[PDB]
Amino acid sequence: MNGEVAPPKEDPVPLPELPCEKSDAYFVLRDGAAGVFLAANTFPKSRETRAPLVEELYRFRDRLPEKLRYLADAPQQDPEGNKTMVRFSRKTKQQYVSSEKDGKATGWSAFYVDGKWVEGKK
């Protein structure tokens, strides 16, 4: 009976081919943060969680759980190269990607509409 709801046990879309911090952990893609994301299997030792980088998704397409065909399908960077990762919007509960340059968050942010990605530059 000892339980706390959503137990640490869970092997949905594990991406062992993506090291986490440095404790032999990896990024096991899961779903429980306003949408989808990839938490470290060493959590909390590694709270590195957040939508999956579209580019890293293309490399993990062979392992894609199929429910990401649209996310990984979205662009994987911007005209400058700032790779674009997945994000989540509550205004429509959907997945929108956003390019990023190093760590300055350029601003690029595309939205996945009806199989219709878009770009809401700001």
From Swiss-Prot:
Domain of life the protein comes from: Bacteria
Biotech applications: Has been used to construct a 2,4,6-trinitrotoluene (TNT) biosensor strain.
Induction cue: Transcription is increased specifically in response to 2,4,6-trinitrotoluene (TNT) and its indicator compounds 1,3-DNB, 2,4-DNT, and 2,6-DNT.
Cysteines engaged in disulfide bonds, as pairs: none
Function per UniProt: Releases the supercoiling and torsional tension of DNA, which is introduced during the DNA replication and transcription, by transiently cleaving and rejoining one strand of the DNA duplex. Introduces a single-strand break via transesterification at a target site in duplex DNA. The scissile phosphodiester is attacked by the catalytic tyrosine of the enzyme, resulting in the formation of a DNA-(5'-phosphotyrosyl)-enzyme intermediate and the expulsion of a 3'-OH DNA strand. The free DNA strand then undergoes passage around the unbroken strand, thus removing DNA supercoils.
Family label: Belongs to the type IA topoisomerase family.
Record text on subunit structure and interactions: Monomer.
Protein name: DNA topoisomerase 1
Organism: Escherichia coli (strain K12)
The organism's taxonomic lineage, starting at the top: Bacteria, Pseudomonadati, Pseudomonadota, Gammaproteobacteria, Enterobacterales
Gene from which this protein is expressed: topA
